[PDB]
Amino acid sequence: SNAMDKYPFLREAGSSFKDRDVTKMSDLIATWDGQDIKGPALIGVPLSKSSISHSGASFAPGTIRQALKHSSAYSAELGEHVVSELLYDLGDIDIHVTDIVKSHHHIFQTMHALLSDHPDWVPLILGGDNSISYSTIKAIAQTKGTTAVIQFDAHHDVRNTEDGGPTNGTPFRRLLDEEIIEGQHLIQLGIREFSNSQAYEAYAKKHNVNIHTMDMIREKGLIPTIKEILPVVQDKTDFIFISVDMDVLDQSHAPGCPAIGPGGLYTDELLEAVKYIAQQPNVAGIEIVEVDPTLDFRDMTSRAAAHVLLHALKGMKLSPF
Amino acid sequence: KYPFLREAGSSFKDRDVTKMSDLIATWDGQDIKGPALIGVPLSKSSISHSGASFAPGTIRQALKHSSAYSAELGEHVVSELLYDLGDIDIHVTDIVKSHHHIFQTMHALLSDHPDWVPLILGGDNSISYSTIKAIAQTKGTTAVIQFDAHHDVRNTEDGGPTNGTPFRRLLDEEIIEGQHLIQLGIREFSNSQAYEAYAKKHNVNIHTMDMIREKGLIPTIKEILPVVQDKTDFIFISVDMDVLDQSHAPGCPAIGPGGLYTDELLEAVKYIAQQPNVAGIEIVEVDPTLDFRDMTSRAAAHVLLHALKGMKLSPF
Amino acid sequence: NAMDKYPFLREAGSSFKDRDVTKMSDLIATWDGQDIKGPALIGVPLSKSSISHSGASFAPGTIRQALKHSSAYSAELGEHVVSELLYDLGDIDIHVTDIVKSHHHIFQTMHALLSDHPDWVPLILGGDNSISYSTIKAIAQTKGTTAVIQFDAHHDVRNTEDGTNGTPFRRLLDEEIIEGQHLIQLGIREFSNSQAYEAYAKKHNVNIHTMDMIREKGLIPTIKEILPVVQDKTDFIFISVDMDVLDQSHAPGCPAIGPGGLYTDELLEAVKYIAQQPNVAGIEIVEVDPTLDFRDMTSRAAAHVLLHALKGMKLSPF
Amino acid sequence: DKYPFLREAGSSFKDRDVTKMSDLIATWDGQDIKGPALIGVPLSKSSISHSGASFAPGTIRQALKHSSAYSAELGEHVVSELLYDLGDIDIHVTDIVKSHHHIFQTMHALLSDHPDWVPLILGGDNSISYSTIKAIAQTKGTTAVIQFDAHHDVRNTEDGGPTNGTPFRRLLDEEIIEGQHLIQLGIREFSNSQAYEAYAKKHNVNIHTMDMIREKGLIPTIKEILPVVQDKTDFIFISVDMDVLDQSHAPGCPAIGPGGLYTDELLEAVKYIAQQPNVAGIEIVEVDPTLDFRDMTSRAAAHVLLHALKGMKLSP
Amino acid sequence: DKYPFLREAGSSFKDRDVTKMSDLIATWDGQDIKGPALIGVPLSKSSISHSGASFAPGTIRQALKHSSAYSAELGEHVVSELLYDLGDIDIHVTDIVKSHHHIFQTMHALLSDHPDWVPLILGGDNSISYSTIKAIAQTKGTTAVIQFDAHHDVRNTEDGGPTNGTPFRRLLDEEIIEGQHLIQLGIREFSNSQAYEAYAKKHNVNIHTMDMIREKGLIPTIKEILPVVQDKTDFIFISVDMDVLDQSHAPGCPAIGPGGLYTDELLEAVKYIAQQPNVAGIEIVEVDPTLDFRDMTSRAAAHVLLHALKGMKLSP
Amino acid sequence: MDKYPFLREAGSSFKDRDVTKMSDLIATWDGQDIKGPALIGVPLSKSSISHSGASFAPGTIRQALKHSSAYSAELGEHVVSELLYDLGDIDIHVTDIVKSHHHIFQTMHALLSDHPDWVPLILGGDNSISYSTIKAIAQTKGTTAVIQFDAHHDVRNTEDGGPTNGTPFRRLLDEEIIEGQHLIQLGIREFSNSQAYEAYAKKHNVNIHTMDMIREKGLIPTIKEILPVVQDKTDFIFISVDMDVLDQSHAPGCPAIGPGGLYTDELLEAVKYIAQQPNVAGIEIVEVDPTLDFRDMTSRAAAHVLLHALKGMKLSP
Ligand SMILES: C[As](C)(=O)[O-]
Ligand SMILES: C[As](C)(=O)[O-]
Ligand SMILES: [Ca+2]
Ligand SMILES: [Ca+2]
Ligand SMILES: [Ca+2]
Ligand SMILES: [Ca+2]
Ligand SMILES: [Ca+2]
Ligand SMILES: [Ca+2]
Ligand SMILES: [Ca+2]
Ligand SMILES: [Ca+2]
Ligand SMILES: [Ca+2]
Ligand SMILES: [Ca+2]
Ligand SMILES: [Ca+2]
Ligand SMILES: [Ca+2]
Ligand SMILES: [Cl-]
Ligand SMILES: [Cl-]
Ligand SMILES: [Cl-]
Ligand SMILES: [Cl-]
Ligand SMILES: [Cl-]
Numbered sequence A: 001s002n003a004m005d006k007y008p009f010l011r012e013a014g015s016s017f018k019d020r021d022v023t024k025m026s027d028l029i030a031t032w033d034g035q036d037i038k039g040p041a042l043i044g045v046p047l048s049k050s051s052i053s054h055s056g057a058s059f060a061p062g063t064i065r066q067a068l069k070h071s072s073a074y075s076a077e078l079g080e081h082v083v084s085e086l087l088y089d090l091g092d093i094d095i096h097v098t099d100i101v102k103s104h105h106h107i108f109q110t111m112h113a114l115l116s117d118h119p120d121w122v123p124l125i126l127g128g129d130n131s132i133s134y135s136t137i138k139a140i141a142q143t144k145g146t147t148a149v150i151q152f153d154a155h156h157d158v159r160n161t162e163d164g165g166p167t168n169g170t171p172f173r174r175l176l177d178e179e180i181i182e183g184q185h186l187i188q189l190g191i192r193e194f195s196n197s198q199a200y201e202a203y204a205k206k207h208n209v210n211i212h213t214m215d216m217i218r219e220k221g222l223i224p225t226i227k228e229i230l231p232v233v234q235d236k237t238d239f240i241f242i243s244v245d246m247d248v249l250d251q252s253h254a255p256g257c258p259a260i261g262p263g264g265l266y267t268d269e270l271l272e273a274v275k276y277i278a279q280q281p282n283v284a285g286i287e288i289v290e291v292d293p294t295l296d297f298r299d300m301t302s303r304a305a306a307h308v309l310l311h312a313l314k315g316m317k318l319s320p321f
Numbered sequence B: 001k002y003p004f005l006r007e008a009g010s011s012f013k014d015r016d017v018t019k020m021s022d023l024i025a026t027w028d029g030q031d032i033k034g035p036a037l038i039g040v041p042l043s044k045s046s047i048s049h050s051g052a053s054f055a056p057g058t059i060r061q062a063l064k065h066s067s068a069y070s071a072e073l074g075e076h077v078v079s080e081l082l083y084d085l086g087d088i089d090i091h092v093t094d095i096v097k098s099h100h101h102i103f104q105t106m107h108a109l110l111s112d113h114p115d116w117v118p119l120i121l122g123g124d125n126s127i128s129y130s131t132i133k134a135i136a137q138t139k140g141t142t143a144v145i146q147f148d149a150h151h152d153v154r155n156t157e158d159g160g161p162t163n164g165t166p167f168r169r170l171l172d173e174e175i176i177e178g179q180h181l182i183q184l185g186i187r188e189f190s191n192s193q194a195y196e197a198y199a200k201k202h203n204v205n206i207h208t209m210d211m212i213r214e215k216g217l218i219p220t221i222k223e224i225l226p227v228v229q230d231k232t233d234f235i236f237i238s239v240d241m242d243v244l245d246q247s248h249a250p251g252c253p254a255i256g257p258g259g260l261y262t263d264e265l266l267e268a269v270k271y272i273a274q275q276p277n278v279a280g281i282e283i284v285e286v287d288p289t290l291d292f293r294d295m296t297s298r299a300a301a302h303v304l305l306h307a308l309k310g311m312k313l314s315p316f
Numbered sequence C: 001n002a003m004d005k006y007p008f009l010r011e012a013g014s015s016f017k018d019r020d021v022t023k024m025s026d027l028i029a030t031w032d033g034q035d036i037k038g039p040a041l042i043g044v045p046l047s048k049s050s051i052s053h054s055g056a057s058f059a060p061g062t063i064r065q066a067l068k069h070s071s072a073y074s075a076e077l078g079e080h081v082v083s084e085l086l087y088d089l090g091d092i093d094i095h096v097t098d099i100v101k102s103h104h105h106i107f108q109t110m111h112a113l114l115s116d117h118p119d120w121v122p123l124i125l126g127g128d129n130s131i132s133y134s135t136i137k138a139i140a141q142t143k144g145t146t147a148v149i150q151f152d153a154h155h156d157v158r159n160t161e162d163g164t165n166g167t168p169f170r171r172l173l174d175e176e177i178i179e180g181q182h183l184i185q186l187g188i189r190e191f192s193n194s195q196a197y198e199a200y201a202k203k204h205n206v207n208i209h210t211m212d213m214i215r216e217k218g219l220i221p222t223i224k225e226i227l228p229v230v231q232d233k234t235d236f237i238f239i240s241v242d243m244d245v246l247d248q249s250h251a252p253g254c255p256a257i258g259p260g261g262l263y264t265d266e267l268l269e270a271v272k273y274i275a276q277q278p279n280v281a282g283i284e285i286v287e288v289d290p291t292l293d294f295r296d297m298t299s300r301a302a303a304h305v306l307l308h309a310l311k312g313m314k315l316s317p318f
Numbered sequence D, E: 001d002k003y004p005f006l007r008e009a010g011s012s013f014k015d016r017d018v019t020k021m022s023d024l025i026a027t028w029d030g031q032d033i034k035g036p037a038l039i040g041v042p043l044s045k046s047s048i049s050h051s052g053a054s055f056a057p058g059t060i061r062q063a064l065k066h067s068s069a070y071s072a073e074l075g076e077h078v079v080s081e082l083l084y085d086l087g088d089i090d091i092h093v094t095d096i097v098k099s100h101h102h103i104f105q106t107m108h109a110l111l112s113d114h115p116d117w118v119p120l121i122l123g124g125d126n127s128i129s130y131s132t133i134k135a136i137a138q139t140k141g142t143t144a145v146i147q148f149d150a151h152h153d154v155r156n157t158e159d160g161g162p163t164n165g166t167p168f169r170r171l172l173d174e175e176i177i178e179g180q181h182l183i184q185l186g187i188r189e190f191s192n193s194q195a196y197e198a199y200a201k202k203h204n205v206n207i208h209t210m211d212m213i214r215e216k217g218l219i220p221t222i223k224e225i226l227p228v229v230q231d232k233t234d235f236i237f238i239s240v241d242m243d244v245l246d247q248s249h250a251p252g253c254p255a256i257g258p259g260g261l262y263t264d265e266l267l268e269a270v271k272y273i274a275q276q277p278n279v280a281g282i283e284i285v286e287v288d289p290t291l292d293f294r295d296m297t298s299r300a301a302a303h304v305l306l307h308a309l310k311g312m313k314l315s316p
Numbered sequence F: 001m002d003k004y005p006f007l008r009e010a011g012s013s014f015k016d017r018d019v020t021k022m023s024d025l026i027a028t029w030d031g032q033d034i035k036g037p038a039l040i041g042v043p044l045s046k047s048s049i050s051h052s053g054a055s056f057a058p059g060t061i062r063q064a065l066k067h068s069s070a071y072s073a074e075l076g077e078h079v080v081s082e083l084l085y086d087l088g089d090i091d092i093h094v095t096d097i098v099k100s101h102h103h104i105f106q107t108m109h110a111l112l113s114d115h116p117d118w119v120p121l122i123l124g125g126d127n128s129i130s131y132s133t134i135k136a137i138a139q140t141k142g143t144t145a146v147i148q149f150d151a152h153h154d155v156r157n158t159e160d161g162g163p164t165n166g167t168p169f170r171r172l173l174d175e176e177i178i179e180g181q182h183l184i185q186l187g188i189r190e191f192s193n194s195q196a197y198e199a200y201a202k203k204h205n206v207n208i209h210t211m212d213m214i215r216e217k218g219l220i221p222t223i224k225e226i227l228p229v230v231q232d233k234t235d236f237i238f239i240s241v242d243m244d245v246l247d248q249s250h251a252p253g254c255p256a257i258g259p260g261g262l263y264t265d266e267l268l269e270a271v272k273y274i275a276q277q278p279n280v281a282g283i284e285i286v287e288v289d290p291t292l293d294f295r296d297m298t299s300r301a302a303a304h305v306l307l308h309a310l311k312g313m314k315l316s317p
């Protein structure tokens, strides 16, 4: 290591501009060796073959990591970095090339073992398509306890399971039907006009899901909408899990989601909401789904996703709990 | 029985989903009651090199993949079915021919089927001359609500019947009156002094982005529409997609900063489409060859969905 | 004929009609169960089976469109390459999520069609490589001892378990549906393969012809020399065209691109030449991915593969 | 200037030891034109398929200008004096029939006023060939046309008007040129219609397919047919339609497919022909920059002109 | 004339009733500069990120030229007589330091020989701001700077030389301007470093974050800090780094992210500031046309220029 | 860590036990002693006359190489048997081109000196790097013949734009770092060059073979006749591959694309033949620009150029 250091101008492959006065996430993220996980740590779930649509979401964990590593870790509103020590990257959950059901078991088992072995781990999950939310939440629910889910989404995601299988749109029907979480502990934020079916809306109502449309959010405001509903739900639950489906964002702000359309959230609105929720007690995890780098302009949507990570971390650093 | 053999190109079907594709039928000559689609694939009329002739296909595709279900209404925006009447035959070479095809086809259909409410898919802005002429001349005295960053009153000497000229022709030819023309979204730096002069000189109701941003789009509409509404028999909605901010409609030939945002436009269209005697709506200046993915075609599909929503709402 | 009164109103999306032109679109008919004589298109939009990300499930759509837009007229023939009509049977339903199921559907469907329509010569539009196992098994078990001509840079004999895009010919050989000595691999490319898989191939006595041999002997010369010998030992031949046999410059839309492949005119000629031979039971085209393509170049290449297949068939002295 | 570091907007790296075509090309000032001179014909609405070939004169100029003028083979510049750029022909945005007269009138007067001008014509779609060839024929005399092309281009005129597919039917039917004086190089399998092929044979057109060419070599087939046609004509005109090239070599043509010419083949052929007595002009058609990869096809077209200039320099 | 349908290479549709910037802008002759004039600075090798900002002066020019000169809200054109285009500053292919010297020397001389010249500067990356501002300050007087930016741009100069992230360190360290005359609008959460924010604070820079701006408003925020700084200075100079805009509004900047200004906000603010007395100039940096969608960001930049032109015209 | 059987390291695709990719063979250099070929990137492109992203090519080429089989069927063995060290990238200054060149020369000179058995596999970077790379070779190893595959002479004067990608063989020749007659230029292309530079090169007696000559005689025979003559006046050979030597259809990601170039087929075969010769001191690949490419076609061709080079070395006495 001094054999190589005698070459002052020789650096490892892929190095970028180094500024000694800068601290970027890349300076704070370490590959995880077995060591004890305290707090937030990243994990990738590159599953996208379950998608109804043709999807490149299996590439998102790579591109979101890249956007994240290239961001400054410094918050001017905190007067400090959002990671105090270091942030582990646990790796990627192995995904079966072929069998989607096998892939889901990989996810549930790894997540379960991980949560149990390291009870202080708060997952930062990089999807992957929407279907992963079944396995991740089930692991939270069956390792942590009664869990509330805050689902940012244009869609209910309660699709019937027999037509496609564990498809993109089925995670929450699977969760509700199997009683992994309760309908009234589910807060859906951003449900969008013309993004849903009559039947599926009915199915979420039967189950007492808390539905907040874009229409409601626009008149009442996102943060006030959450203050109005979150307290009630927290009172019936032990933990909260934040599921961010990036297609809740307006197509102009997230062109890289498979299901794009007008009438959605703007990113700064989302970032603020995530930071708010992240400060609340017993936040068990956050996942980001439905980013598709092959559909993106440059990597705008992966950058937007990375900022969701930064603002969640910010919220956690800020929380009293 | 070839249970696993399927029609070419067919995809995921879901019993619990009702998409527009489930409700749109190829027209077979049956009587037309209410909204029906018609394509107008003309774009050589354009001053700018334009692929707007492909818009009818892309907008159809985006519309067909959308849910027909409205949550605000608790019902689908189309009760029974929605005929797609086809495309107007556009000549390869002669643009004046193409305008005759449009007017004469529109005229015969409005005539044969007095309950047809046209949902017109352009095509570039030049088509408005012939679509509105057919409306005025079959339905009577007509008010036009023109969402546009531009006046569209260019001269005809320099380039023939270009996409820039349709409202000059319409005004000069007294087929509509200026005072029944409502222009929403007229944008600073998008227009010409002499052309604005022409519009004022005809008493066009001009509402700029400045006024809309101050007053708000619907309130701006609620102030002038009632007026024009009571001195006309019918209203027609001309939506030029370049009224939208470039960030929201990246696929229009004439993009720039400082336009309407989509949810804003969508609300305004539903509000107008609720009014009595809406004779039709057309969508122009979508160019899928300039678009990102099909963002701007999806925005146009949603303009239609919201128009349909407003029409479903009207009886109440 | 109620629309005739609207002389300028046409069907949605119908374009420039030229009266003196006959395109494939004019001759391809949506199939409605009628008895099938000769060539008929069928789509197999499976691409999830791909090791790498693949929009191959879209190729049947884009190859269809490129075919339809091509003229049906061959000047070397002085006639259209199809006379009456060419049925399009449709697409094999593939499960969105279950891939074993999808391969069972493909086999079941192909088998039922080949049984019920003995004069059907399948023009199969993939879809990725893995469909070859299901399509060829149907052929061998319904038509009989079958020789395979696979154009390909890769042996496609990858392990079936440990990690299935590059497995079809291992499954094929292992289950003895086909004999290695009846397998002719054309275009196998330097640095596209693994010692183990080549050994597996040489172990089953497959006829391997590398790009080096083909560039030395010439492609047609190579074929004339090996093909008749294999026909002597078999009852049918099946043409499997993996488009990645083509140089990246000629087929940019294949997942596995690299330099040193065949050129498209060189492959078209060879396909025409094979398609005149006795008892051609079918042809398939795999590994076209419209999402990786420039414009639709590779779909156009594939569509021309079909045209030259049809052309050879109409030329066949049998 | 008194500002050593101030240059004209958009200046490029200047290398004193290098001479690019940009250093030799000069906008026409009205002087007498002796030898080759560029003229642009930015017309593409006449195209059957949607086409941006009207941008090609610009993109081809740009690629030509950025090239070296020096031929290592000649040991001199393919033009060491100057090469005028006559400008562009005015294209009506709407009326293509009118646009064709513009082209014919302009070429005819330029040709009549400057008998030593050899046009280097930059299209534009293949439809300009009627008007350019008519001007050469009715100005120079009996003209052989060497038409590099995948297609016969003898489409009937009724369907689309004078589209880019009709030019040689118009020429032959109106007796502007004789069939036996038309040499078609590169006619490609599956690119043509029965009726159109038969039309060509009826007029005794000299048809050389890609198959014949791949069997004999392009130059040998040229050495075999050319002397016959020269024996019965006074002038040669070269019409290069870039879709004669394989799609992998000319991605930017509207009609691409496999099995065409390779660019080096074409370049050698064009230089060989340009060496002959009485080459009256060359045109390049069907370059579409909006469909190209980078500007490959416009670069290929720029080299076609460079190799023509080279051959004209080489002629005894 | 003699050839009626022959026009200059590349000429566009001319319309007689429309005055676009391209009719007003004139390639500079050397005559005395009265008022605003354009000058290009095609430098981007000084950027940390791989950047094509050297193409922006051309793309922004192109966008500007195709824009209407007519301001509806003004009832007149923002330019009255003509607007000179001074040309481009010579940028060395290889030596980034030499390029900065060229910029300062050229700029210094022009502002000395033409005391009435108001620079409309088209970059180029942010690194130019040192040479441009220093030139204003050392030729004009005590200078106030309004920096629209998501970043402080006070990076240390040791790690990479005079890169695009350093200009305000160089400016402050050398006391070319005082920190308390530096107004930073749009400083963005997560776009900056602790040590760099401290350097800015140590120097008493006026820092306004996106957060603060979102609370008070952009125009209010300005009306409140500007008067104070104008007391202490003789001129204000406007530095617009386009990456101050949200990524959805300016996709063509190297450093894109969410949470930025919207183009309409920015345009209003530029207009406001440009009304003030003693505006010595404006520069636009960090537009990268090779990263853009179409030329949206170049159009956005063209429009900034128009709202500043508009602003200057409406003050005595 | 093995505790979680379905957890793997970030970015891990699936591995086939029976496949051997260059990825299974390439290791980050820990300082150990270099025996044979080793990779090294030179991410420099600001020195390019045209706007150039060739600074990204070391990454994209490395990715393409790593994903390629190492197995040569024609050889019946892998082209690497041991391992292949990736030394890393030489640090390129964001701003100072001349300092960056010094960095390259000095890292290069230092490395070749401390590891006598290193055969550099260099990844450009634009062509301006050749000056510092070849100088390091010449002054570290001895008299060197240079075979440059190139459409252009690259003898541009240095005064107009400084040490650009156009100037490396001017600098090399002017400073008598090599002799003209030791430079073999393969692929020099019609209309790609200027009268004055062709003259410079001829004045220096450089061996010039145009595409025309090559198309007439064949690339390999052309080489077979001039190469021994130069090996005769030379102790080592260095292979300089500028990829714009390739036809645009085959290498669309090179800043300078035009028709009438070499095809990758011929180039591959030529590099392998040359790399078979005694005393091949190294190879560099320059002028691939990933930002201009279609997919990564041109980086893939570069990766194959490297594969065939190793194959030649593997195959040499
Ligand atoms: C086309 As966009 C930058 O508004 O997503
Ligand atoms: C798709 As190509 C122009 O590289 O052959
Ligand atoms: Ca969703
Ligand atoms: Ca969802
Ligand atoms: Ca308009
Ligand atoms: Ca408009
Ligand atoms: Ca293969
Ligand atoms: Ca294969
Ligand atoms: Ca033609
Ligand atoms: Ca043609
Ligand atoms: Ca900035
Ligand atoms: Ca900045
Ligand atoms: Ca070169
Ligand atoms: Ca070179
Ligand atoms: Cl979803
Ligand atoms: Cl318009
Ligand atoms: Cl894909
Ligand atoms: Cl494969
Ligand atoms: Cl287009």
Ligand SMILES: [Cl-]
Residues within 6 Å of the ligand: D126, D151, D153, D164, D165, D255
């Ligand atoms: Cl044609």
Ligand SMILES: [Cl-]
Residues within 6 Å of the ligand: E126, E151, E153, E164, E165, E255
């Ligand atoms: Cl910056």
Ligand SMILES: [Cl-]
Residues within 6 Å of the ligand: E050, E051, E052, E290, F051, F052, F053, F291
């Ligand atoms: Cl770049």
Ligand SMILES: [Cl-]
Residues within 6 Å of the ligand: F127, F152, F154, F165, F166, F256
């Ligand atoms: Cl070079």
